[PDB]
Design an enzyme around this catalytic site. Structure first.
Site, PDB file in Angstrom:
ATOM      1  N   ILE A 155       0.853  -1.177   0.000  1.00 44.57           N
ATOM      2  CA  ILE A 155       0.000   0.000   0.000  1.00 44.57           C
ATOM      3  C   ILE A 155       0.890   1.227   0.000  1.00 44.57           C
ATOM      4  CG2 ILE A 155      -1.948  -1.097   1.129  1.00 44.57           C
ATOM      5  CD1 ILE A 155      -1.081  -0.481   3.652  1.00 44.57           C
ATOM      6  N   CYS A 156       0.492   2.236  -0.760  1.00 41.22           N
ATOM      7  CA  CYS A 156       1.186   3.504  -0.686  1.00 41.22           C
ATOM      8  C   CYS A 156       0.527   4.359   0.381  1.00 41.22           C
ATOM      9  CB  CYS A 156       1.179   4.227  -2.027  1.00 41.22           C
ATOM     10  SG  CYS A 156       2.587   5.336  -2.182  1.00 41.22           S
ATOM     11  N   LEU A 157       1.337   5.162   1.053  1.00 47.87           N
ATOM     12  CA  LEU A 157       0.838   5.886   2.219  1.00 47.87           C
ATOM     13  C   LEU A 157       0.013   7.138   1.870  1.00 47.87           C
ATOM     14  CD1 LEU A 157       3.648   5.012   4.700  1.00 47.87           C
ATOM     15  CD2 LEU A 157       1.360   4.028   4.279  1.00 47.87           C
TER      16      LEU A 157
END
Lengths: 73, 384, 149
Positions: C85-87
């Protein structure tokens, strides 16, 4: 030196830069020329996403190179 | 049941056409878009591999980057300005200087109260800057420090000096004398780069290194005013069409937002009308609070309420997206010729109508397929 | 000693007061890995499911962000093919002012509200943006299949 920035809509922008200029300094030059805040833009050279901290020489961008302005994340 | 003003008809046409046609509003032929994207994508293609398949893989991957409308808030403001002003007057508007919104926003309000609501059509363009202070402290020996080649936007601790090099390369002596600098230099360890925004060292110092970094952060905060950390962050426009008679003045905000939504999504969500209903005074007041508050929650809430994708206000500026740095709101104002704006919109509709298709969806699909075919063809041509 | 005092303090503070609806415990082999379980947010298409995640603190934390990936399959536009997941920090960047807990709350929030216009899975995000109802139903189905045991 002088470089070019092209948009998807065909527009070309010319900028005077130095090789020690960071990518963020280039984005601010685009802002002064086009009204696009640095946060709302990405740059591409030779199919690579540039990072704000790095420099033009860090990517071997030499005179008359052509970057691409990307306006979608 | 009188007719609305020409100035209001600009808003209604801009909103309606942008909802329907999206990406076509630029007036740029699909072929141009496809060729430009081919030129962007040709480096990713390995010339010794399968050419047909690499091309189709690249075309199907970057399709959205091509046939969806921009998310750049700056590019959206430019599009709006060019529709409403035309190329020439939009260039003159761009070289107009930005004004800072005052602490309570009375300078914008005052401009608005000296133009009669019935006499003019106003376009306001805003830019929001955020503070981006240095976050790294570099402890280096004097002999290894040359200011011409040092990385920018950092604080530097030498044996005898404390320097800040800003984003543009300006060198600032921060002021402590040699003995203070000897103290700080030798209180700090040997890791080289340290953090200036680490709450565990700044709020729970346990060793002299933490206290030295804390003293540096204080020395820097006490003279922040000498520096310029502002970086252009958000952009948007407000249109105020003329009213007729004693009708009250309405305003409409237009924006896109990077990584969040397009101008088209904005109009489809009617967030323009929603914010319109609060009134221009309330809107300016909260803009001014946004640019003035020192409280993170208040800043984040106003920003989310005003700039979020509709329906995401609760998460837009929460957690990792909290607005922890000060903001600055700037504006510039110009008059709109509604006749010219309506002509630019009709010329864009004429462009749109040159595309085969029965309903807006069908012309949009023609435009997208043309862009994909022009990119496939231009890649095939570049690979010979 | 072993780990920097900031990681030790964050670990003990997370364990003492967990994030509601999130179990987060350090691995016993290596304390830079955290086993995380996030319960599907109420009123979201992942309601009912439990989703396991791995959270890794790189050597340069807190100057580098943590690395988070889903260990449970999920139909989400911001999770990629490998579960990463990208933040999702728009018009800002990661900094040591942020913490593991802020990261955990952000992941919980992205479950509660996907963002198709900042996608890691372009196909999932496209189906999320054109046929939202179809993507919601697919998300419920994958919660049934992989997230309820």
């Amino acid at each position: 030196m002088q470089i070019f920035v092209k948009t998807l809509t065909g527009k070309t922008i010319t900028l005077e830069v130095e090789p020690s200029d960071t990518i963020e300094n280039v984005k601010a030059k685009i802002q002064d020329k086009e009204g696009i805040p640095p946060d709302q833009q990405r740059l591409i050279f030779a199919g690579k996403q540039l990072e704000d901290g790095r420099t033009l020489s860090d990517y071997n961008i030499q005179k008359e190179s052509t970057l691409h302005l990307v306006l979608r994340l | 049941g009188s007719l609305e003003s020409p100035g209001f008809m600009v808003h209604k046409k801009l909103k309606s056409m942008s909802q329907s046609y999206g990406v076509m509003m630029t007036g740029v032929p699909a072929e141009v878009l496809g060729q430009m994207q081919a030129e962007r994508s040709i480096p990713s293609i390995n010339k010794t591999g399968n050419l047909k398949q690499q091309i189709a893989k690249e075309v199907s991957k970057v399709c959205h980057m091509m046939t969806e409308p921009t998310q750049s808030a700056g590019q959206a403001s430019n599009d709006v300005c060019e529709l409403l002003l035309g190329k020439i007057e939009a260039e003159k508007f761009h070289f107009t200087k930005y004004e800072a919104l005052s602490a309570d926003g009375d300078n914008l309000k005052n401009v608005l109260e000296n133009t009669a609501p019935s006499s003019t059509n106003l376009l306001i363009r805003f830019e929001i800057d955020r503070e981006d202070p240095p976050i790294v402290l570099v402890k280096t020996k004097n002999e290894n420090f040359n200011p011409e080649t040092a990385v920018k936007n950092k604080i530097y601790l030498l044996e005898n000096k404390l320097y800040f090099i800003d984003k543009m390369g300006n060198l600032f002596n921060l002021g402590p004398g040699k003995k203070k600098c000897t103290q700080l230099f030798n209180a700090i360890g040997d890791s080289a780069e340290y953090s200036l925004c680490d709450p565990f060292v700044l709020e729970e110092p346990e060793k002299p290194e933490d206290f030295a970094i804390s003293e540096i952060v204080d020395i820097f905060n006490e003279q922040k005013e000498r520096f310029d950390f502002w970086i252009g962050s958000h952009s948007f426009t407000i249109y105020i069409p003329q009213t007729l008679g004693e009708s009250p003045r309405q305003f409409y905000p237009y924006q896109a937002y990077f990584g969040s939504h397009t101008l088209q999504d904005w109009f489809v969500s009617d967030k323009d009308e929603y914010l319109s209903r609060i009134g221009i005074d309330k809107y300016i007041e909260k803009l001014a609070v946004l640019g003035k508050t020192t409280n993170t929650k208040e800043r984040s809430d106003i920003y989310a309420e005003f700039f979020s994708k509709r329906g995401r206000e609760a998460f837009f500026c929460a957690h990792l997206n909290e607005k922890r740095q000060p903001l600055r709101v700037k504006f510039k104002i110009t008059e709109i010729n509604p006749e010219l704006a309506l002509k630019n919109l009709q010329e864009t509709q004429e462009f749109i109508d040159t595309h085969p298709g029965e309903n807006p969806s069908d012309k949009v699909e023609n435009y997208r397929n043309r862009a994909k075919l022009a990119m496939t063809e231009h890649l095939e041509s570049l690979l010979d | 000693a072993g780990l920097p005092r900031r990681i030790i303090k964050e670990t003990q503070r997370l364990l003492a007061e967990p994030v509601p609806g999130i179990k987060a415990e350090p691995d016993e082999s290596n304390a830079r890995y955290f086993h995380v379980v996030i319960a599907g947010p109420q009123d979201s298409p992942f309601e009912g499911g439990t989703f396991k995640l791995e959270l890794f603190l790189p050597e340069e934390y807190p100057m580098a962000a943590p690395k988070v990936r889903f260990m449970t399959k999920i139909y989400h536009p911001n999770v990629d093919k490998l579960g990463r997941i990208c933040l999702d920090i728009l018009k800002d960047k990661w900094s040591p002012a942020l913490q593991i807990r802020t990261v955990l709350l952000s992941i919980q929030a992205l479950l509660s509200a996907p963002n198709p216009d900042d996608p890691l899975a372009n196909d999932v995000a496209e189906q999320w943006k054109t046929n939202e109802a179809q993507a919601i139903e697919t998300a419920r189905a994958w919660t049934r299949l992989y997230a309820m045991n």
